[PDB]
Amino acid sequence: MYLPTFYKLFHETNAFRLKRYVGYGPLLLTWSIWTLYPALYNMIYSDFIPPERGVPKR
Amino acid sequence: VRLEKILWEQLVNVKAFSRQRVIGAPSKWYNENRTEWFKVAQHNAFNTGFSGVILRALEPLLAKFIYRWRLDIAHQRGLTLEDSLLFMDRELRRCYFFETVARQNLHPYTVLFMKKRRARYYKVERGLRGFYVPDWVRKEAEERQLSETVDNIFNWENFVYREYMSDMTPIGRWTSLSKITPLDMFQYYGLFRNEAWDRFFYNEAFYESYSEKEKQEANGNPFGKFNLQTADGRAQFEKEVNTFIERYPFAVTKPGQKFDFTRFYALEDLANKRDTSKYDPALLESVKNELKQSAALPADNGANKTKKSKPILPDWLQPKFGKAFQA
Amino acid sequence: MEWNKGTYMSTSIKKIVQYFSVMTVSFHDINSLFGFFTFLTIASQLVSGTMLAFSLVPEPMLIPMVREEEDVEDLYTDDFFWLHERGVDMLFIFSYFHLFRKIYLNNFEYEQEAAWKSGVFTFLLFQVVVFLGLVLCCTHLSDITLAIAANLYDTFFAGKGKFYWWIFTSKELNTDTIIRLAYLHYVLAFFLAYLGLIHGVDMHYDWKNESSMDGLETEMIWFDEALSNELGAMIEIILIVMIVCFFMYPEPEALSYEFFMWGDIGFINDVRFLSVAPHWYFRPFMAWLTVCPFHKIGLFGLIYYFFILFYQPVIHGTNEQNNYTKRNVAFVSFFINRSDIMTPKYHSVEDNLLHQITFWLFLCSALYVTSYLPYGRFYNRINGNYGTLWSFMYIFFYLGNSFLRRPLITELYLFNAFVKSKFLKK
Amino acid sequence: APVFLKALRYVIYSYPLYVCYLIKQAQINAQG
Amino acid sequence: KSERLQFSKARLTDFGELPQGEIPTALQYDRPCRVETLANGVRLAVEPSSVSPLA
Amino acid sequence: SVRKAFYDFIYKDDKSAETYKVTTADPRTPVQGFRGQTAEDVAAKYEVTKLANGVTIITESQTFPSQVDMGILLDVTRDETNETSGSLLSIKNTYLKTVLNTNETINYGVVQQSGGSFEMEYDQETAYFKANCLAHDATDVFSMVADCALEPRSTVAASVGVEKNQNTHKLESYLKTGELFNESVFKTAYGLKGLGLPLKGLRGNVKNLSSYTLQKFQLENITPNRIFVCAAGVESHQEFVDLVQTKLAQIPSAEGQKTHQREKSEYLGGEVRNLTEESNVTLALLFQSVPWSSADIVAFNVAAALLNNLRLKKNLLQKYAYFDQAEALNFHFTDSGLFGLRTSGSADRAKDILNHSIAELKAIASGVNADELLTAKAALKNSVLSALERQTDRLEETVKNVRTFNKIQHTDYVKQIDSVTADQVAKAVAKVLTSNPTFVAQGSQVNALPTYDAIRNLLK
Ligand SMILES: CCCCCCCCCCCCCCCCCC(=O)OC[C@H](COP(=O)([O-])OCC(O)COP(=O)([O-])OC[C@@H](COC(=O)CCCCCCCCCCCCCCCCC)OC(=O)CCCCCCCCCCCCCCCCC)OC(=O)CCCCCCCCCCCCCCCCC
Ligand SMILES: CCCCCCCCCCCCCCCCCC(=O)OC[C@H](COP(=O)([O-])OCC(O)COP(=O)([O-])OC[C@@H](COC(=O)CCCCCCCCCCCCCCCCC)OC(=O)CCCCCCCCCCCCCCCCC)OC(=O)CCCCCCCCCCCCCCCCC
């Protein structure tokens, strides 16, 4: 007979609920990317992909 | 997802490493009595191996700073070690498990006397600090030896295990407190517990336990492996018992008297199959009577009873005396 | 929210008035009154800070001149500022004495959980407010504190995308940063009062002046019998503090720690980095940062200290299994021939001597940590003070490790004595 | 008894010692 | 018979339970049952049980 | 595998999966790649063996492979005293609570996850635990049943039982159940001692059902010679004998030791008349009929069947509109018995109800017709064989027959029923009528009823 420990049942149920809630993480990430897009652009093009070192002749 | 059959379990818990889960007959959670576990662990730590050798050398310091210290403080307070060990002040003051067990099983006096003994001292200490209990109270405190406190402690712990701790099944749980604080909000109970991951089922066989050899060895002679039949063994045993009595004043005898070894040997002979008439018949009768009395649970005589109350309404709440023919 | 069962007390005016008019307090000593002193200092801090707020203009370039000019033209303003500073000092003193007292009594039991954590959270918040307050001084000390806080905040984000800007704009004290931090300071300071009220309501569930369970059932009525004693003990401690400060601090002094507060942001650009030192209450954390030159490890040490301070009842408590929990032991397993160990039971406070020794080692380590500044100019080029490292490591070990608290040796020795006595007497 | 819990206990015990070792190495480096 | 002991637990090879496809031995046997159709369309089914005391 | 994990992560069917094909097949057709063997029933063989200590095991071979049923019977309410009255009720309300080997939670989960059932019941002279489960779970379920039946009651179990007994008493009083009335009937018949002791237990003693009283009751009653173990669906008797040996062999033999024993029962024909301001009046009239050992038990069962199925409905309920419900009660014990009627009707005209019940009861003593006897016998056969068809009930009555008589008599109930004749039933009922009546009345107008002597004269 199958007599799983209630510890295991709680762990599995919480793992499934965490799986369910992780699905909305990308949703909020997309919402915060659509919003504050200028901030994302500054972050992506300030630290990552740093500007080239050069100045105009004038 | 199932915790069993997870990739780690599949790779590790396999017959090759002898890490496979074994399913047997169902058994209760908390299968091991704590008192027995501590007895066996203490025997292994003190009377065996390098740890035993080290701890034997520390007997003087431990006796001075862990036993006589507590005893001196308790005697100053008019108490004994029982008052601090049978029921911890934590349990006595605020503990719902202890409260429920005591209500369901214990007679009120068993804890009322414990509380009143401390009330004696703390009605004076709080009023005026530095209170030293006078000699007359200290005498009744000193009368009881540790040999009865240990019996009470073992009885209580074994009862609690066999009746309550043996009928409990812990489960995965969230924060007990319904507090809005996020730190308390997301407390997770069930993981990081060895018992939670050691066995995923109530049918699993137990993989860690004390061997029968160790359990039987822990019930031998605490002082050491001697032979009370031979004179050489008895001499060493008596020497060790005498030094023990010196180290622990109120453990087995009053701090000014000496232990009666002949009575102890008579008790050992009567208890075990070994027998002989080397002891006086009076000694045997006294030992048997003492053994019977020590194992006798007190009972109520049903005598010297107070009067029960049958209250009645006062006179002013009752009709007047006169009563005439109604018509 | 079905998981949240409810609240212990409904903090309504009617019920609060009834509860405080019917409250009873058991007979106690001064050691168990540091909480009342902390609450009273919080109340005086609220009042004095409200008085100060009407004087402080949140513009950085006017705060020094405004403070200097409004102490003369207005009476009692400098008195309120001094009261605020000394109230912060005494609040830290009382809070830490309360923490030490509650650690001493082994209040990590389950029945103390609600009492303990609600308190620690308050303490945690009490830290944040203090930090914000420092920023309002607009001195070089405030500049350094803000810079360190901004770097710590930016540590979590690996220095990407200026996530700190919403509070620490440019990591410098300017009009925006000062305004935001001042308003947050005021709001959180007033929130501390409610947090303290909640903690005080929670802690009364199981309140004990000493670990030993006195059998007394009669108790004092709080309103005046206990309140008068609390006020009197506050008076006594204040007298002692006044005497100690009067004698330990001569009127004119040489080389004080306030000398780093000379520089005012904006007026003075150059900073004398040779003598950088915060107030004594934040001294231990700056000392830890100097001792641990690694940024991530220092931040982790701070976070671990605070959070392990929060989670004492869980690591060291009964855990609802009634001492049938099994620990993890490194070496004792070989000695006992067992993988795990049942938690020991007999861990009284007044009687046992190991508990007192370990607790006082921890307290003295904390005092030594706050005793001085490591002076990082050459604290590492010169082999650093070994005492500071020892004290920090003992603080880390004492908070979190259960072999220094609830040790197994006492239980094993007591069981050995029990077995020997029972065998002798059968 | 679980391997990972025992490893966590070992890490808890030994990490401060590793921090002390790192600090000592940092001091030796600072000597130059 | 699978083995000597009826109450054996050998087939329970999934943590004390049968695997997904397997079934208890007792359910591997079915009583005889014959179904026939008549000209009128009436369908007669019989599943005899000799040991039973009623019909 | 990877495919199963992927198709489970996204809730989509896996068409190529064999399990999906098996679980989504046409119900009108057989499964593609599976087919079960055909088997034929075999006769039932009974075997009884006594252990060294005194425990006796009954077993029945499997007629057709089905679920294994197991049971423990105890000769232990008749054996309770005033001090420990109601202990059996507490055990029943907490029959799953054990602490020595398995926990209440675990022994409930075993029943739940085994797919079987576990139950307890208790009569005046019997206490039966029965669990039915699958073969592979047989060992665990048997261990659970033995622990529940024979393990001493614990303090926690005692407290839970006290609470549940208080709830049960409140419910019984609130519903005015027929058992509450039968308790008064038994008290009148035999007095507060012995059989008259209520099955639910004295209400004033509920608080005293502590672990000490329960353990004393078990020690003075539960003995190895009073324990029976039964199984049904067992391939081999020896396997179950070994299973029982591993568990019940420890119990030291009680032979040669002072046993509690049972005092012989005494019958008294008292009367009870309760005023309750009830719109309806319930009466019961019972007489000492016969014990199990007698040969008229079949006759009394046939008489009860004739009353309930044919006579009581036709002559009492159908004809008269003030008869709410009439039923014949028939109880047999090792040394005593009680056969009679229980009729509930309108409170007013209770005298008419009493007279009609007496007349109907006396009608059987007057005689029984052939057609009525045949109809009653047919109904009795139908009921008994319906009970016997199910394995659990058949096993239970096998245990009861073995404990009453060393032989098994339930395999030939049809022969005994056929042997009954109208003359025998009439004579048995007529002889029983002469006994001292046991008359119980409840209702609004119980006071305005004939006296006990008047009732006896009417029966005479
Ligand atoms: C001083 C001047 C300024 C005053 C500002 C006042 C607030 C303004 C906004 C809201 C206005 C409407 C108020 C309606 C209240 C209705 C509920 C009520 O009265 O119940 C009694 C309630 C207690 O409820 P309970 O059921 O007993 O739960 C607590 C238990 O004791 C359980 O105890 P425990 O130990 O388990 O928990 C410990 C602690 C642990 O708590 C935490 O750790 C969490 C941190 C605290 C809460 C943070 C909230 C952040 C809100 C940001 C708002 C931004 C501005 C915009 C606002 C407009 C809306 C967006 O728990 C709490 O403190 C939780 C109680 C929260 C109290 C605040 C409730 C109101 C705000 C709710 C959200 C907005 C509602 C708007 C409704 C109207 C529509 C606009 O008591 C109070 O309200 C106490 C008032 C104290 C006032 C002092 C100043 C504090 C101001 C609030 C906190 C600010 C923190 C800093 C924020 C910084 C952001 C950057
Ligand atoms: C635009 C203008 C707007 C208007 C502006 C004006 C506003 C006026 C507000 C009027 C408030 C009326 C309050 C009524 C209650 C007062 C107490 C009472 O019953 O008096 C009888 C009492 C009779 O004498 P007694 O026989 O010796 O009894 C003394 C005991 O107090 C006798 O107490 P006990 O031992 O019998 O028991 C005390 C307590 C048992 O103990 C407790 O439970 C204590 C309370 C526990 C919870 C609270 C903890 C904190 C303590 C209270 C706060 C104290 C600090 C307040 C600070 C305010 C800001 C600075 O039991 C209770 O009485 C329970 C209720 C306590 C009062 C709360 C409920 C009623 C009032 C509030 C109802 C509405 C809800 C509030 C919000 C309303 C918002 C509109 O009268 C006095 O003794 C009065 C003495 C006054 C002179 C001495 C102090 C002078 C100040 C010196 C400092 C320098 C300034 C000089 C003055 C300058 C000019 C002002």
Ligand SMILES: CCCCCCCCCCCCCCCCCC(=O)OC[C@H](COP(=O)([O-])OCC[N+](C)(C)C)OC(=O)CCCCCCCCCCCCCCCCC
């Ligand atoms: C509105 C309702 C009422 C609300 C009440 C609210 C209550 C709030 C309670 C909290 C208050 C918080 C502030 C507490 C301040 C405590 C004091 C303090 O900080 O120190 C003050 C000051 C020190 O403050 P300071 O500002 O100089 O501190 C120096 C700066 N630090 C500390 C940072 C280095 O102490 C004193 O100087 C006071 C004592 C003066 C001397 C008098 C004592 C002499 C003792 C020796 C005499 C021996 C004589 C023997 C011979 C006799 C011969 C005749």
Ligand SMILES: CCCCCCCCCCCCCCCCCC(=O)OC[C@H](COP(=O)([O-])OCC[N+](C)(C)C)OC(=O)CCCCCCCCCCCCCCCCC
């Ligand atoms: C211990 C303290 C206790 C008391 C205080 C309690 C605090 C409770 C927690 C509050 C958190 C509030 C975070 C607000 C952050 C706003 C700024 C920001 O997002 O980055 C600015 C910065 C803006 O950069 P910037 O380059 O535009 O900055 C301006 C710089 N100048 C002036 C020079 C032009 O964002 C970034 O650079 C990062 C872009 C990230 C893009 C992807 C989205 C990530 C997720 C965003 C989540 C936002 C949630 C907001 C709502 C939160 C509600 C709770």
Ligand SMILES: CCCCCCCCCCCCCCCCCC(=O)OC[C@H](COP(=O)([O-])OCC[N+](C)(C)C)OC(=O)CCCCCCCCCCCCCCCCC
């Ligand atoms: C990740 C790690 C993060 C850090 C966490 C670490 C834990 C932090 C816990 C903090 C607890 C703080 C509790 C403070 C309680 C006390 C408050 C207080 O008093 O105010 C602070 C006080 C006041 O500080 P202060 O700054 O105002 O003045 C002291 C000035 N200095 C620093 C120069 C000394 O701080 C202290 O100095 C306290 C310790 C002083 C100890 C001096 C004792 C006498 C020494 C004599 C030496 C030997 C002479 C004779 C030799 C020969 C004979 C043997």
Ligand SMILES: CCCCCCCCCCCCCCCCCC(=O)OC[C@H](COP(=O)([O-])OCC[N+](C)(C)C)OC(=O)CCCCCCCCCCCCCCCCC
């Ligand atoms: C940035 C890198 C960070 C790396 C951090 C690594 C930390 C390692 C030490 C702590 C690990 C966690 C301890 C708790 C584990 C759960 C409880 C337990 O003991 O389970 C034992 C159990 C059972 O142990 P058992 O097998 O001994 O029990 C059976 C014993 N018999 C058979 C005798 C009965 O094993 C598991 O199933 C757990 C497997 C490990 C799961 C670990 C998950 C958390 C850590 C990884 C997080 C993700 C990191 C990603 C990094 C990415 C980098 C690019």
Ligand SMILES: COC1=C(OC)C(=O)C(C/C=C(/C)CC/C=C(/C)CC/C=C(\C)CC/C=C(\C)CC/C=C(\C)CC/C=C(/C)CC/C=C(/C)CCC=C(C)C)=C(C)C1=O
């Ligand atoms: C073990 O048992 C115990 C308890 O049981 C729970 C306890 O409660 C406690 C203590 C716990 C408590 C919560 C009670 C603390 C004890 C006492 C005596 C109270 C301390 C506080 C005070 C004396 C002040 C009381 C103040 C108030 C009620 C008002 C609160 C604030 C309000 C309404 C808003 C304030 C608004 C402001 C703008 C701040 C400025 C206010 C001013 C008056 C100054 C400026 C004014 C203006 C108008 C500009 C102890 C010690 C205990 O032993």
Ligand SMILES: COC1=C(OC)C(=O)C(C/C=C(\C)CC/C=C(\C)CC/C=C(/C)CC/C=C(\C)CC/C=C(/C)CC/C=C(\C)CC/C=C(\C)CCC=C(C)C)=C(C)C1=O
């Ligand atoms: C993340 O960013 C954020 C922050 O910064 C980081 C924040 O700070 C915050 C929170 C902060 C804020 C929104 C700013 C709030 C600031 C606060 C609370 C600071 C002020 C605190 C105080 C205690 C101020 C107290 C003030 C006083 C006592 C002044 C008293 C003055 C007066 C006039 C009182 C008398 C008058 C009245 C009561 C009005 C009644 C009516 C009259 C008198 C009528 C008179 C007229 C006639 C005709 C009769 C948030 C939410 C945030 O998101």
Ligand code: HEM
């Ligand atoms: C428990 C409550 C409070 C604490 C712990 C606290 C803490 C502090 C601290 C540590 C300082 C800096 C002192 C120094 O550097 O010497 C400070 C300054 C300040 N606080 Fe608070 N504070 C509290 C409440 C308040 C409140 C409620 C307000 C306003 C309503 C306030 C307003 C101010 C102001 C204006 C300053 C700067 C004054 C100046 O620079 O002249 N404080 N606070």
Ligand code: HEM
């Ligand atoms: C500003 C911060 C704090 C305030 C205002 C405060 C307030 C109080 C007060 C008034 C009491 C009652 C008086 C007393 O017990 O001495 C108390 C008790 C208590 N405090 Fe706090 N406290 C604070 C910080 C803390 C901290 C840091 C802790 C623990 C880390 C804590 C834990 C407790 C506990 C457990 C009690 C009850 C003691 C017992 O039951 O015997 N509190 N607190």
